[PDB]
Amino acid sequence: MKFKFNPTGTIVKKLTQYEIAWFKNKHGYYPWEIPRC
Numbered sequence: 001m002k003f004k005f006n007p008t009g010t011i012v013k014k015l016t017q018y019e020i021a022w023f024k025n026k027h028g029y030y031p032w033e034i035p036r037c
Contacts, residue, residue, distance in 0.1 A: 001008050020030060027034055 001012070003009060025032070029035075
């Protein structure tokens with residue numbers, strides 16, 4: 001699912017708030033402003 005009006009829009013956004021952490025430990029970013037090696 002990938003809608004903006006649907007109700008899942010909020011949930012998917014919240015559930016991700018915790019998933020992003022996993023990636024945050026790999027780099028510590030979120031947006032496209034991620035560095036490189």
